[PDB]
Amino acid sequence: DVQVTEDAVRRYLTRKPMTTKDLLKKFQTKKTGLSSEQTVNVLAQILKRLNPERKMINDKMHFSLKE
């Protein structure tokens, strides 16, 4: 079984800045097992718990964490 955790999303943020929309699709390419709707609810709650920072790149809003 495959599950989504804060560490998963945080891993991407630490590497490169990504947007909320990008994060969603990020968990679409790989078979998560859970419905797309479920990912939205979890992704929306997970992000809040992680409390990622907000950055403006190329006139766009992106999220990036600084370990």
19 is in an annotated binding site: no
By CB atoms closer than 10 A (0-12, 13-18, 19+), residue 49 is: exposed
Q: Can you say whether the dihedral through the CA atoms of 5, 7, 12, 17 is positive or negative?
A: positive
CB 47 within 8 A of CB 20: yes
Exposed, middle or buried, 17 (CB in 10 Å: 0-12/13-18/19+)? buried
Query: Would you give the end-to-end CA distance of the chain in angstroms?
Result: 28
Task: Tell whether residue 62 is among the known ligand binding residues.
Answer: yes
- From 3.90.79.10, 3.30.70.60, 1.10.10.10, 1.10.238.10, which CATH number describes the 1-67 domain? 1.10.10.10
> To 5 degrees, how large is the angle CA 51–CA 44–CA 25?
110
Burial of 32-43, coded b for 16+ CB within 10 Å and e otherwise, reads: beeeeeebeebb
- Asked whether the beta carbons of 39 and 25 are under 8 A apart, the reply is no
Residue 22 annotated as lining a ligand binding site: no
Q: What angle do CA 51, 43, 22 make, to 5 degrees?
A: 90
Burial of residue 59 (number of CB atoms within 10 Å: 0-12, 13-18, 19+): exposed
